[PDB]
Each structure stands twice: as C-alpha cells, then as structure tokens.
Amino acid sequence: PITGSMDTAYANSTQEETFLTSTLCLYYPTEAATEINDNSWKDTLSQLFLTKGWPTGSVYFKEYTDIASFSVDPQLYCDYNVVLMKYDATLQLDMSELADLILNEWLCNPMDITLYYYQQTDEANKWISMGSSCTIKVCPLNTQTLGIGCLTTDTATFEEVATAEKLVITDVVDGVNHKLDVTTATCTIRNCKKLGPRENVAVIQVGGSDVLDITADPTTAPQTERMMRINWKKWWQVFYTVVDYVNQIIQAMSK
Amino acid sequence: PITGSMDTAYANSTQEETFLTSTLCLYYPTEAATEINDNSWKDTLSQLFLTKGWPTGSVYFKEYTDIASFSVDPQLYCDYNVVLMKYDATLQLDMSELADLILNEWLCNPMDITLYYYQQTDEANKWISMGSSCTIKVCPLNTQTLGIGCLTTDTATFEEVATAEKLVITDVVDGVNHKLDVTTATCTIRNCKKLGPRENVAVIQVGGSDVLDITADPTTAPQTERMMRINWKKWWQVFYTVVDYVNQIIQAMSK
Amino acid sequence: PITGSMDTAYANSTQEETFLTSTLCLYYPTEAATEINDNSWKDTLSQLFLTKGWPTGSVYFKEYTDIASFSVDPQLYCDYNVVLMKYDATLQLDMSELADLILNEWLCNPMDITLYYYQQTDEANKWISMGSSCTIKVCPLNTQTLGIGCLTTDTATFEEVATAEKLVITDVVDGVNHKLDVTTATCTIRNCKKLGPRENVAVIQVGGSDVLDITADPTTAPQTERMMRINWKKWWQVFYTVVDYVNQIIQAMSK
Amino acid sequence: PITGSMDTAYANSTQEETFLTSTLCLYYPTEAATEINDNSWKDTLSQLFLTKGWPTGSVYFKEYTDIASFSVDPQLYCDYNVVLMKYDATLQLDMSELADLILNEWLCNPMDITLYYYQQTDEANKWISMGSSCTIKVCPLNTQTLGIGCLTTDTATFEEVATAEKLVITDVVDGVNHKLDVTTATCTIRNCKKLGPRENVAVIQVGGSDVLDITADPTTAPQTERMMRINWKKWWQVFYTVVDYVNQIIQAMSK
Ligand SMILES: [Ca+2]
Ligand SMILES: [Ca+2]
Ligand SMILES: [Ca+2]
Ligand SMILES: [Ca+2]
Ligand SMILES: [Ca+2]
Ligand SMILES: [Ca+2]
Ligand SMILES: [Ca+2]
Ligand SMILES: [Ca+2]
C-alpha cells in the first residue's frame, strides 16, 4: 500500500526516461532479413531509431530462423522485446505455444519422468517441455498407481499427446497422477505454474486475419495490448512502421 | 413476474445439482476418434469424468462422421451437448448453417413446394432444408403470381440458391412470394421461425483463427458464450481439456 | 454550436427521406455476376428493391472485375455505395489498401518525385500511389540530403517497398526526408493526409473468417459499422440478403 | 519502509525454516572427487547431512572440472550454493574473475561488436565476456570516431587485453568509446552493470595463504562473509568440515 490521495500531479513525459535508460530488442525471422537484402539494414534502421529517440548503442537485432527454434532458445536479451511473427498457417499452434511463453510470466521446476509420476494442480499448472524433438506419451493413474486405459509397464499403451514438437505446453485433467514418457534424449519437460504476464514482448503478427486463442480452456479468450497485428506488404515496410511507432509499441509494454 | 426484493441470498453451488441430475453428450468427428486409436478411450475419459464430478452412467459419446451428416441427423440426445468441430476451410458455411441450428432455438412447419408458393415474414423467418442432396431454385412473384426474371412454368429460368447441400438455411427478400423448386426426392424443406437460443450446445471450435459470422444479415455479429474455441495440438489433448474444464463449459450453457 | 436543450422530440422515420431523395450503388466483382447467369438479374433485383423502398430509377449496379482495378478506378458514383468483396486470401493487403481508401475520407496533393525528396508528418500523412504497375523504391536522407544506407545517385541501393501493385498506401518513418523512385510511367504517387471517415461505403465481406486490421500501426485496431460481413453460400443469396437488409446497411452509413 | 518500533522480539531459530524449505548445492573440482575414490561418497555425505538437519532430497553435488569451465557454465542450481576452490597459483586471476561473478549480483545486455563501438560509464559498468577462447583487442576512440594509437581499420594496431581466456571481466578508462575486436566465434561479450551481491555462494578457498583482491581498482579491498577459507589436508576432511559447519556457512549467505 500506497496512500490513495489524489494530488493529482502527473509527472511529465514517461517516454523520456525510457529513451535514456532502456534497451530495445527486435526479433525477426530469417526470411524477413533475407528479403531486405542489404548489408546495412540493421544500421540504417538504427539511425532511423534516433529519430524516435533511441541513442545509438540502444537497439539490438536478434534473428530467429524459425518459430520452433526461437520458441526454445528465446532468452530475451533486452529490457523491451518486440518479436515479429509472420503468419505460417500450418505452424499456428507452434506459434500459440511460443506466444503463451513470451507474453506471460512463468515459474518452473524440473521433473524426473523416470522416478515420480506427476499431476497438475490448477488452471495454472502446466507442463512446458521443449527441445530438438519433443514426443510426450501419458498414462493416467487411478488412486492405486494403476493405469486407466494403460499399463504403467508398456508405453505402447500410453496416450500420445505430442509428436516431435520444438515447444509444447501440455495440459492434463487436473488432479490426476500420470506416468509420463517423454523422449528426454532430445526433450526437456518442466513443471510450470503461470501468472504474471509480461510487461515487455509485443508479439506483432504479420499476416492472415487473426484473432488468437491463447487459452488452454474453451471458455476464455484473452486479448492483451502486448499482442499487436500489422498488415503485410513488404518487410522493409514492416520495419519502417515498427520504427515509426516504437514508442506506441513500447508504451503498450513497460518494465 | 417475480418479486424483486434483494434478499440477497445466493443458494450455494449450482454445479452440485447438475452433477447429480444431468447428462453430458460429447459430439466429435470420426477423425477425432481414429487419431486416438484406443478401444477404451471412451472408458478412460469416463473415469476421468468422475474427477470433475459426473457419475459413471452420466456421460455419452456420439460420433458424427461429417459436418454435413451431423448437421442433418443431429438429434441432441442429452441434457447438455458440447459438440467438437475442427476447422475444415472449404466447409465453413456448412459449419455456419449447422451452428446456426444447434446454438439456436427453432420453430418449424412443413412446406408444400408443389401446391403453394411461399414468403418469409421477418428477420426471423427462414427456410431450413436438409437431407441427402439439397438443391433449391427460387422464382420471386410480383403481386400477380407472375415471375420476376422467371416463368413460373419453366424451372430453367429459376434462380439457384443452393446446389446439393446437406443443410441449408435459405434467406429471401422479406415480404415477397416465391415459387420454390426443391429436389424433394433427396431434400426436405421446412419453414422456420427463429428465436430462443440454446442453453445447451457449446460448439467448441478446433482450429484456424476464428471469428464466426453466424448472422444472415451484414449488420450484426453475435458472439455468445455457447460458442467456444480450443487450440489444436492432438485430439487426446482436446478431450483432456474438455474434461479438465467440463464445468466451465457446462456453466456457459444450462437447462 | 448547437443549442443543447433536450426538447426531446425525435422527428419520425429517417428512412423515408433517404428512399425518396438518395441513390444506392452496388459494387460487385465479375465472378459474382457470372455465377448468376441471367440477362435480367440487375432488373429482377431492382423490382425487389422497390419492396425495401427504392424507386425504380434509384439503384445502380457497377462491375469491378478485380480488387486491383476497382482499387484504382473506384470513383464512387452514388450517394450510398455498398461494395461487395469476396475473400481471396493472396490479395488480402490489396483488399486492405482498397478498404482504407473507400472507408475513409482522404485529402491529397501531387508529388514530384523528380525534383523534391519528401517526408510524412504525422500518423495521418501517408503516400497513396496507384496505377498499372506501382513499384516504389525509397532512400532515407539524413539532415544533409545524403543517403542512409543508400546513394541518392544509384537507385540500385534504394529500398524497395512495393513491387508492382495496383494500389499502395506507403508508410515511412515520420519526420525523415526520402528521395523517392517510383515508376511514374505506369504509376501515380500522391501525398495524402487522412481523416474523415466515410459515411457511405459499407464494405461487405464475403468469406473467410475475418477480423480486419486496417491500421498502419500495430497498436490500434478499428472496427467500424461501415465494415460488414456475410456468410457465403451462393451469389444469388448474397444479393437477396443485401436487398432484404438495404436499410439496415444504409443506416450503418448516411450522408 | 518499515516501521522502526523496537518491539524487540526476536522470532526463534531461523535455521529451522531453511532446513525445511531450502536446497544446498556443493560445487567442487574433479580432482576433489577423484581423491575420494568411492562410488558412494555423495551418498555417505548425504546421510551425514541429515545430522546437520537437511532432509534426504535436499543436498545436490555439482562437479566442475576446471575453474575455467565452471566460470562459464556455472548456472547456479540451488537456493544455496557453496563452491569449493583449491588454490592453483597460475590460475589466480581466472579464479578472481569467477569469484567476482558468483559472489556478486550482475545485470547484462548484449553487445554487437560488429556494428557499434562502445564505452563503460561508472566504476560499475564492466564488460564480462566468456566462452571457449576469449581474445579481446581494443581501440580507444577520440571524439571523432578516430583511433588513438590505432586505426579503426586494421586490428593489427589494436591493444590486446585478453588472450584466450574462459572468463574475462574487462575494464577500460571510463567515458571513452572503443571499437572492440573480440573473437565472437568462440567468445561472447556482454555489457554488465554490477551491484547487488550475493546472498548465496560462499566461495570456500582451499589452500595457499590468501587475501583476495577482487576489486578492479587499487584503492579498495572488500572482504565479505561469503568469502571463506579452509586449511587443506585431504579432500575427505574438507567435506567433513563443510558438513560439520553447514549452518555456519549457510548463515553467512541467505536468500
Ligand atoms: Ca492407450
Ligand atoms: Ca490443468
Ligand atoms: Ca433466372
Ligand atoms: Ca428474411
Ligand atoms: Ca539499399
Ligand atoms: Ca507516418
Ligand atoms: Ca596498438
Ligand atoms: Ca570503468
């Protein structure tokens, strides 16, 4: 708690502290840069970024070459991250799972699939696994440690819920134990509790028509400010717009 | 009328009367079950349904193999019906016409295309025809029982508004008589007045991106709670979610 | 200013002045009419239009054969214009750029790409170019009239932002001068300031699923009443609906 | 702020919350374990750890095989980390640079050596680079972007400040721009701001005589509690002591 008195003073600007003290990291796909075909595009855009008010050493340009790799290896480097995603219609869920991770605040612990069969607790306990090739088979346990539609002994009776993905947020019926069978060789599966959203990313979507259903349930559909959309023409245009509206995009994030 | 006094008592639960006294019917497409590949999937899910609070003999599993057949033969068996529809982009309107029927409350009478040329009255009088192959040709009549752009005598001058569909909700300019030419051999066309919505279905949509325009007009777009959407991964996952959020889905329907 | 006193007397109707004094212009694509296959469809619909209250000589039918040509040559002829656009997924942005032009109120001046390098001023200053084949390459100037990632001398170093389009609304980082290189032979590029919206069109969209992002930025998404959507079945049905709901559609425009 | 009233109540124990809720991670070098020569040393010590009050699944044993690799790949896994370092006199600075990283709280951003010549701001802005082989050459710029004792064009005139290290905290004259030339192939260099110390590690030093100068300047010498020293005899003895005084060591860290 804060005291609630309406002094009523708004302290001027806000954008003049962020220009001085914060970093902006732009994530794009390879195809984006390839279409631009210049050895100095990162540089040209940077001078253009001074216009919008970001000092030379301020803006960074990170190249993901696919939504699957980016979804994994996506350690967000800067204060503000605005990631460019161009609609690929077959990869939609890949994209959804990646958005769900960046746009939100995640808390995870490690899981030992080998020794302890687990269970999710609430609408916020999910299993986020990611890596080379993630293949997850599951087997629900009744209150005896016995299978239900499966033999905890032969994984050929398990239920496959992911076949070789690069990022996967698995959801099982809450309050039920499950013997898990991941391909830990190429995958890593961790038990995460959700929450806090992200006051950074700003997934900007290129193409389609969208409406984005990023919930695991069917009941809710959340539309946040850190979820923007741009009409595709050419990649140079996309970047010009991102620059011409940096502050607007940053203002939709913060901290 | 009810008395409006704010006694202000909410009577506890609500979900503990529906668990005891109601039935839940899950409609899915063949492909859904085929991908699951287990002889006991209906059973496993049922035990999982006890968790969410539905007694053994409570939940039923109905298999439509196509949106066209389901759209016809779709006599809703249970108290609560939640129908799973997975995006098929060419069938969209087939899907729209089917949604329009389940999600809403319909009143129909039979039409004799042979002896009496009809007319729709308001934004709620529509002609819902369905069957093997529904092919409807129409001919608008001026106030003399004469064609307008057609000869009430030769159907080769009629205007075709449906070419072999499995479910069709036809709409004509309100307040105008029309000689109708349906292929009654394989089709049945009935005159329906709309209305009451449905406090049951809950069309859950798999895939795409959606926004759904289920009005006949251009002016309105209604988005109801009984119109949910899930992000596709695998079918086992879809069902796990439907189970993990049965009550949430049921609560969005009722009665 | 008007006086604000609540006399409170709504003057009756509104639709009975428009029926008498206004004109309605329907724009459709060739494919639309071709599917109808009648030499008297324009006529039949016209008699049907008397029902909804539009005197014989009132309604006009204009045929665009493509979104690209219509986007150019689209001088709106009548008081009320309702344009029918059927989803074509590869042409989306072509469609977006065309919508942005009809649905809005535009102010333009001519640009001489040859003698004066320009700059856009605010989120409302855009460069709308259109013609046979519009190909625009740009070169940002620093405060010296020198290129930034380009040589104002060789257009092989310019940045291409449009490759042969029929309608293009170009957006560059605000407050920066640019030497422009359009193919003026087949294109015309003009400097427009936006604004006033249109109290006429009513782009009615056939097919897809839509949500339409018609802003240049990423932050905003505006959804107006003059942006309607219809579920595709057959073209005859589309027109019947447009007629059966003319007033509803007109009421969503006006003046 | 907290209220400062001297209620004067100390709440008992402190160690009985840490025993229940926290994890202890012991880092040692390979040589340490090799000298122990038992397949069950990790296990024996664990039972011994119950004595000091740490439940079975509580303590973890991580093996760094060198100060250089550990310095890189040293993602601290547990709540409390106590790292064992045995004096190697040629690697002193390697050790100093590693201590400086664990014992302290670090904030970093990524640097693009290719496109932007940087500068450090205060006694707390340092360049921490680490990897396979880190070789950093520097070239100070006067206020013109011109070299000072170097040609920003030929790196053969640069000043080498690190020749193939595994962890390097580089320090340059504050407030001066520098064109940097790292061997990014095998190295990664990031711009870090220092600060917060670490309320965890507890570098325990084996051998020598020490006094440790972990500042970049010459003026200060900080000696913290999270910087302990043990007299070498045998490795088994070292671990016995670490166990016999776990709480004492933990108490010198916390949170
Ligand atoms: Ca199975
Ligand atoms: Ca769950
Ligand atoms: Ca005809
Ligand atoms: Ca009607
Ligand atoms: Ca260029
Ligand atoms: Ca602009
Ligand atoms: Ca030198
Ligand atoms: Ca310094």
Curated annotation (Swiss-Prot), chains A, B, C, D:
One of the GO BP terms on file: receptor-mediated virion attachment to host cell
Region (LVD motif): 180-182
UniProt-annotated stretches for the region GPR motif: 196-198
Post-translational modification: N-glycosylated.
Statement: the UniProt record of this protein carries the keyword Signal: yes
Subcellular location: Virion; Host endoplasmic reticulum lumen
Region (CNP motif): 108-110
Glycosylation sites: N12
Single GO cellular component term: viral outer capsid
Disulfide bonds: C25-C78, C108-C192, C134-C187, C139-C150
Annotated Ca(2+) 1 binding sites: D38, G149, T157, E159
Keywords: Calcium, Capsid protein, Disulfide bond, Glycoprotein, Host endoplasmic reticulum, Host-virus interaction, Metal-binding, Outer capsid protein, Signal, T=13 icosahedral capsid protein, Virion
Recorded GO MF terms: metal ion binding
Main subcellular location: virion
Residues engaged in binding Ca(2+) 2: Q120, D171, V172, D174, D244
Domain of life, per lineage: Viruses
Job description of the protein: Calcium-binding protein that interacts with rotavirus cell receptors once the initial attachment by VP4 has been achieved. Rotavirus attachment and entry into the host cell probably involves multiple sequential contacts between the outer capsid proteins VP4 and VP7, and the cell receptors. Following entry into the host cell, low intracellular or intravesicular Ca(2+) concentration probably causes the calcium-stabilized VP7 trimers to dissociate from the virion. This step is probably necessary for the membrane-disrupting entry step and the release of VP4, which is locked onto the virion by VP7.
Further information: Some rotavirus strains are neuraminidase-sensitive and require sialic acid to attach to the cell surface. Some rotavirus strains are integrin-dependent. Some rotavirus strains depend on ganglioside for their entry into the host cell. Hsp70 also seems to be involved in the entry of some strains.
Subunit structure: Homotrimer; disulfide-linked. 2 Ca(2+) ions bound at each subunit interface in the trimer hold the trimer together. Interacts with the intermediate capsid protein VP6. Interacts with the outer capsid protein VP5*. Interacts with host integrin heterodimer ITGAV/ITGB3.
Family to which the UniProt record says this protein belongs: Belongs to the rotavirus VP7 family.
Protein name: Outer capsid glycoprotein VP7
Organism: Rotavirus A (strain RVA/Monkey/United States/RRV/1975/G3P5B[3])
Highest classification ranks of the organism: Viruses, Riboviria, Orthornavirae, Duplornaviricota, Resentoviricetes
Residues of the full protein shown: 58 to 312 of 326
